[PDB]
């Protein structure tokens, strides 16, 4: 019937698990759903430790904070990502260093990472953009050579793989989102993943207001209220049971687009690195508009008439007022993808026929056969 | 049957409202439950504007941030409160200034506020401790005289009144919590209250990642992911319908304690200022232990044997390692209340007979008649 860009997929299992929380009275800080969801999620990723938090933004904040990021530190990030990749650098008092993206993968270009390293660089936040893993063997090699931490922004990439390893398990710390449009949702929520048990323990302590559990209201350091609630965790357990089903659907939609755009010179889907498997959170394309002479917003209005919802690519962060002081270089590939890019519908509510209809209608609107 | 210190009170209305959210697919950022809960809450408080956020900590952070609190600013706070009153000052880069509390009300002592004002003071965060309103006519008079903002930490005080005005509507901005133990819960959540519509509009924008709604992913300033979710708001609407019932129960429990401790020289309940009505979140007492020669933890173990749960008073924040640099003065009254104080059970799950049993058993354990 209807095409959905990124709507969540909720039904009877979610209702059941949420009613179990209300009935147990475990909806808040204390309860068994949070540690159950932490352990089931860490098992899915094949990582030692996970900590459940209130958002993906909080996950990235807590990861940088745990790693001791502070004023004077430089943190390298792509120019194309959601702004919540970068804001946490500024929360810590650190300096973002923006680098351009690969023209085919749309991910942080490691050659641009290496050119931007200084005596002040402490970390890299690669983003698995639209669920597409970054060039992690090269990123990790650069980080090892310069003594840098790697924080994976895996928020769009739950289920994506890099050479048989789940995203979020390669860097020093991984960060996930369970916001409404992500491949699973808790309404709001996120997760920290790490193989360092000490980092994971200290982060769980910090996101629970740094309260000494052996005392009453005694706090040995400054913390945060960043914990996931048990209400959210009960929903996240239901969604995690369905995650394999959802990723099958995402990968199917992506393959349906990869086919109908096949051999069409004017449409380039985002490309995977060899050995990587995208989660295909939002199959996204670059359009060669030279022959077409329509803008993306014109293409989007034509699609909207046909009941096909879309979204533009993240704006280049270097043109936001707080970040333009850090605009260093042309960011040619970032601008090409923003100017010519479009994200296509991929809610797990969709049928294969809906996706095929979307891809075929776009070819009509663009006057291709 | 069982006495409960502060457990939430959830049943069929909460289940109904939460299932309406899951069924509508509105569990995340977008949806009608958040603005419905904002408007119903603002009507309950008789204030122009409310913004729903992810915690009480976030509410206080966003309030200080909105008011332009920054490095070099001094913010006056009580030495006895939950640490999340103070942490947000440090999140903003500002300096906390700790002052002692009134020996009878346990609230921020306005004479100590005035002695601690300097050329750098920008704001005061009075705390309505255990739901007991502060001396707001005097606090507001001091703030007017020195050009200071007043941010009410009303997190424990939903339903409390000051001279016929609801707490959170007196200062420039009010802050509420819906954590599991508060008088209502959304699992996790909070609320900003203000009569300044511009402050409320800019705060709602900031807690939604400062995204320009007229564009796609364009952010004109640094924001936060601090919004309440629609799942949380659907639960908060159910609880808000029951708030009058719950406050009746809280005030009943408090009056039951006020009676059985009546004329007993060794037990002093927290006192209200003339014209104020506590929400009695946790009826809390100071014990004259000179004749009794038991510590509070000894008294708590005796109560625990009788199935009476209790909690100690918030620790004095000036003895936490990050804050001891700001310990300026003796804080005599803060230490007296911590050393001799105890919080008594007041979950809205309790019966009047449970409370009477608790109060009477304490008199036995203390060897009073």
Instruction: List CB contacts (< 8 A) between A225 and chain B.
Output: 54-58, 84, 188
Question: Domains in chain A, ordered, with CATH?
Answer: 12-240 (3.40.640.10), 243-365 (3.90.1150.10)
Q: Which of residues 232-261 of A touch B (CB under 8 A)?
A: 232, 235
Distance between CA atoms of residues B150 and B144, nearest Å = 10
Nearest CA in chain B to A91: B91
HEC string of B290-315 equals: CCCCCCHHHHHHHHHHCCCCCECCCC
Contacts with B82 from chain A: Cβ below 8 Å: 217
The answer to whether the CB of B316 falls within 8 A of the CB of B271 is: no
CA nearest to A186, candidates A355, A361, A27 = A27
Nearest C-alpha in A relative to B28: A187
Spatial separation of the C-alpha atoms in residues A270 and A280, rounded to whole Å: 9
Chain A residues with CB under 8 Å of B225 CB are: 54-58, 84, 188
Please report where in the chains the tokens 């879309």 appear, as a residue: A310
Q: Name the residue facing A231 among B55, B187, B220 (closest C-beta).
A: B187
Going by the DSSP 8-state scheme, the letter that residue A9 receives in this structure is -
Angle, CA A334 vertex, CA A330 and CA A335 arms, to 5°:
75
**Chain A residue at shortest CA distance from B83:** A219
Non-local CB neighbours of A157 within 8 Å, separated by 6+ positions: A128, A131, A132, A133, A167, A168, A278, A279, A281
CA distance A329 to B289: 71
The answer to whether the CB of B34 falls within 8 A of the CB of B210 is no
Q: Is residue A194 within 8 Å of residue A173, measured between CB atoms?
A: yes
Instruction: Identify all chain B residues contacting A61, using CB atoms and an 8 Å cutoff.
Output: none
The pair of structure tokens assigned to B52 is 């729903």
B219 CB neighbours in chain A (<8 A) are: 83, 315, 320
Q: Which residue of A has its CA nearest to B218?
A: A315
Measured between its terminal Cα atoms, the distance across chain A in Å is 25
d(CA B254, CA B279): 9
Q: How far apart are CA B260 and CA A15, in angstroms?
A: 45
Q: Do B15 and A19 touch (CB under 8 A)?
A: yes
Q: Which of A307, A194, A224, A311 is nearest to B224 (CA)?
A: A224
- Choose the closest CB to A315 out of B10, B90, B216: B216
B122, B182, B204, B250: the active-site residue: B182
DSSP string over A190-243: EEEEES-HHHHHHHHHHHBTT--TTSSS--SS---B-BPPHHHHHHHHHHHHHH
CA B115/CA B112 separation, integer angstroms: 5
Contact A196, A188 (CB under 8 A): no
Strands B173-177 and A341-343: unpaired
Resolution of the determined structure in angstroms stands at: 1.4
Distance CA A294, CA A291 (A): 9
Strand order in the sheet with B49-53: B49-53, B190-194, B173-177, B149-153, B121-124, B74-78, B95-99
Rounded to a whole number of angstroms, the distance from the CA of B289 to the nearest CA of chain A is: 21
Which residue's entry shows tokens 């204390």?
A30
Chain A CB contacts of B295 below 8 Å? none
- Out of A181, A217, A223, whose CB is closest to B315? A217
Closest CA to B17 of B229, B235, B246: B235
Binding-face residues of A in 195-224 toward B, CB within 8 A: 209-211, 215-224
Burial of residue B326, with CB atoms counted within 10 A of its CB: 0-12 exposed, 13-18 middle, 19 or more buried = middle
Beta strand B149-153 with B121-124: parallel, antiparallel or unpaired?
parallel
CA atoms of A15 and A9, how far apart (whole Å): 12
The residues in A 316-345 lying below 8 A from B, measured between CB atoms, are 320-322
CB contact residues (below 8 A), chain B span 279-298, against chain A: none
8 A C-beta contact, residue B65 and residue A225: no
- A218 closest CB neighbour out of B7, B18, B315: B315
Query: Are A221 and A8 contacting, i.e. CB atoms less than 8 angstroms apart?
Result: no
Residues 80-139 in A contacting B (C-alpha not used; CB under 8 Å): 82-84, 87, 90
Closest by Cα among B202, B253, B254, B191 to B227: B191
Following CA atoms A216, A221, A225, A231 in sequence, which dihedral angle do they give, to the nearest 10 degrees? -50
| Residue in the block written with tokens 């004017």 | A266
Q: How many residues does chain B have?
A: 369
b/e per residue, A343-353, with b = 16+ CB within 10 A? bbbbbbbbeee
Q: What is the DSSP letter of A172?
A: S
* B145-148, Cβ contacts within 8 angstroms, sequence gap of 24 or more: B146/B117, B146/B121, B148/B117, B148/B121, B148/B122, B148/B123, B148/B124
Residue that has been written with the tokens 């350091």 in this structure = A221
Tokens 């005061």 sit on residue: B124
Pick among A95, A217, A315, A348 to test the B interface (most B CBs inside 10 A)? A217
Tell me the two tokens of residue B94: 């500002």
Distance set, CA B202 to CA B125, B224, B259, B367 (Å)? 21, 12, 47, 57
Whole-angstrom Cα distance, residue B276 to residue A317? 50
Question: Residue B55 has which token pair?
Answer: 């915690």
Which of B 134-173 lie inside 8 A of A, CB atoms?
none
In chain B, how long is the greatest CA-to-CA distance?
Answer: 70
Look-up of token digits 């402490």: A122
Strand partners, A177: A190
What are the CA-CA distances from residue B184 to residues B155, B169, B189 (Å)? 11, 18, 10
Residue B28 has its nearest CB partner, among A180, A315, A320, at A180
Selecting from A57, A224, A314 the residue whose C-beta is nearest the C-beta of B217 gives A314
> How close is the nearest chain A Cα to the Cα of B188, in Å?
6
- Which secondary structure element, helix H or strand E, spans residue B21, and what is its range? helix B12-24
> Which helix (H) or strand (E) element contains residue A175?
strand A173-177
Q: CB neighbours (10 Å) of residue B306?
A: 13
Q: Closest CB to A217: pick one of B10, B82, B232.
A: B82
Give the dihedral of Cα atoms A132, A138, A140, A142; nearest 10 deg.
-130
Number of other residues whose CB lies within 10 A of the CB of residue B324: 10
How far, in Å, CA of B185 to CA of A41, rounded?
27
In sequence order, the 6+-apart residues with CB closer than 8 A to the CB of B44 are B166, B240, B243
Question: Of A182, A204, A249, A250, which residue is the catalytic one?
Answer: A182
CA gap B134, B127 in Å, rounded: 7
Which tokens belong to B105? 């009300």
Q: Cα–Cα distances in Å, from B73 out to A250, A324, B6, B90, B247?
A: 50, 27, 36, 10, 37
Measured CA to CA, the distance from residue B48 to residue B105 in angstroms comes to: 29
- The DSSP call for residue B45 is H
CA distance A13 to chain B (A): 11
Q: Kindly state the tokens that stand for B182.
A: 């508060």
In chain A, what's the furthest Cα-to-Cα distance?
70
**Contact predicate B89/B137, CB 8 Å:** no
Residue A338 burial class via C-beta count within 10 angstroms: exposed 0-12, middle 13-18, buried 19 and up: buried
Report the residue of chain B nearest A59, measured CA to CA: B225
Q: Count Cβ–Cβ pairs < 8 Å, chain A vs chain B.
A: 158
How many CB atoms sit inside 10 A of residue B69's CB? 24
Select the residue from A31, A57, A83, A155 to test the B interface by mutation, using most B Cβ atoms within 10 A: A83
Tell if the CB–CB gap between B83 and A219 is shorter than 8 Å: yes
**Beta bridge mates, A284:** A343
**What residues of chain B lie within 8 A of the CB of A230, using their CB?**
187
- Tell me if A188 and B54 make a contact (CB, 8 A cut-off): yes
Beta strands at A149-153 and A121-124: parallel, antiparallel or unpaired: parallel
Chain B residues with beta carbon closer than 8 angstroms to that of A343: none
**Residue recorded with tokens 């799950």:** B349
- CB proximity list for B229: less than 8 A, separation 6 or greater: A187, A188, B27, B28, B29, B34, B54
What does the DSSP 8-state code read for residue B225? Answer: B
Closest CA to B53 of B169, B185, B188, B194: B188
Residue from A112, A107, A146 nearest A130 by CA: A107
CB B28 within 8 A of CB A185: yes
A353 touches chain B (CB under 8 A): no
What is the rounded CA–CA span in Å between residue B158 and residue B154? Answer: 7
Nearest to A185 among B28, B54, B187 (CB): B28
B120 in active site: no
B233, B37 contact by CB (below 8 A):
yes
Instruction: Burial-class residue B182 by CB neighbours within 10 Å (0-12, 13-18, 19+).
Output: buried
Query: Which token pair is A362?
Result: 């776009």
| Buried b or exposed e, range B260-284, using 16+ CB within 10 angstroms | ebeebebbbbbebbeebbbbbbbbb
């Amino acid at each position: 019937c209807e095409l959905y860009l990124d709507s969540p997929n909720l039904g009877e299992l979610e209702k059941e698990y949420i009613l179990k929380a209300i009935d147990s009275n475990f909806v808040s800080t204390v309860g068994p759903f949070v540690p159950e969801f932490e352990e089931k999620f860490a098992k899915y990723l094949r990582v030692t430790s996970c900590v459940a938090v209130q958002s993906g933004t909080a996950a990235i904040h807590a990861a940088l904070y745990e790693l001791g990021i502070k004023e004077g530190d430089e943190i390298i990030v792509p120019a194309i990502t959601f702004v919540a990749t970068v804001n946490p650098i500024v929360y810590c008092g650190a300096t973002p260093v923006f680098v351009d993206i690969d023209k085919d993968t749309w991910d942080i270009d490691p050659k641009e990472i290496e050119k931007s390293i200084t005596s002040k660089t402490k970390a890299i936040i690669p983003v698995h953009l639209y669920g597409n893993p970054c060039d992690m063997d090269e990123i990790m090699k650069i980080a090892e050579k310069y003594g840098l931490y790697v924080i994976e922004d895996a928020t769009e990439s739950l289920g994506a793989e890099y050479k048989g390893r789940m995203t979020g398990t390669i860097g020093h710390i991984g960060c996930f989102s369970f916001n409404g449009n992500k491949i699973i949702t808790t309404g709001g929520g996120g997760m920290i993943s790490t193989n360092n048990e000490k980092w994971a323990s200290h982060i769980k302590f910090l996101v629970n207001q740094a309260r000494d559990a052996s005392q009453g209201y005694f706090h040995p350091e400054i913390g945060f209220n960043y914990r996931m609630t048990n209400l959210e965790a009960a929903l996240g357990l239901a969604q995690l049971e369905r995650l394999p089903e959802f990723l099958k659907k995402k990968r199917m939609y992506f393959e349906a687009y990869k086919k109908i755009f096949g051999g069409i010179d004017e449409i380039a889907l985002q490309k995977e690195y060899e050995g990587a498997i995208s989660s295909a959170w939002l199959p996204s394309i670059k359009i060669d508009r030279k022959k077409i002479k329509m803008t993306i917003p014109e293409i989007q209005d034509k699609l909207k008439e046909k009941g096909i919802p879309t979204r533009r690519i993240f704006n280049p962060i270097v043109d936001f007022p707080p970040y333009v002081k850090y605009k260093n270089g042309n960011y040619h590939n970032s601008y090409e993808i923003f100017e010519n890019g479009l994200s296509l519908p991929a809610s797990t509510l969709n049928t294969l026929e809906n996706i095929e209809y979307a891809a075929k209608t776009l070819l009509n609107i663009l006057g291709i056969k």
